[PDB]
Symmetry: C3
């Protein structure tokens, strides 16, 4: 709802691409990772998502990882 | 041309994704809906586009729907 | 690294889509063109990339083409 804290996030690939997401602060990042792989034509097993150098787990949320609005998640291809 | 009113629009999926479009104010939204389905790997029959709760028809234009620059179109998956 | 000049670029298709990239100023635009075709579901032979009306070659870089931060590259479908 409009009463949640939504956080804007940028997902930046090593290929230069920057894709935007907006999700609630307590939403598991699996939501974003699955969406990203589906929409950008990538497979989960071939890419790795990291934030401030640490890999992001399925149930990690922006709030849990202490993300702030407009933070960037890095994507590496494997 | 540079003499038209171009409107920036955000298309926000229920999956958290936010995809940007820029089209002239009198352009039918079919342009955006087809482009979105092609580029994001979605099929038209499986997604529904709405603006301020109302479904968007093929020939509806941002001007006709009284959209403003930076408005958001919502996408639901079916 | 953080000591390079990274340039934000927008790639605007004739279909209204606007896709964002961030690459170093001396990086060949082949990086962006390949990424764009892969992610947006397009084939290189079917699209043409231009900047200020001139086609972009594989090894052209934003700096070489005298691009500035937030410039737009145009994409035409063939």
């Amino acid at each position: 709802t409009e009463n949640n804290d939504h956080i804007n996030l940028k997902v930046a690939g090593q290929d230069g691409s920057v894709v935007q997401f907006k999700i609630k602060r307590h939403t598991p990042l699996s939501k974003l990772m699955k969406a990203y792989c589906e929409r950008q034509g990538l497979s989960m097993r071939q890419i790795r998502f990291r934030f401030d150098g640490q890999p992001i787990n399925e149930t990690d949320t922006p709030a849990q990882l202490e993300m702030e609005d407009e933070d960037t998640i890095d994507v590496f291809q494997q």
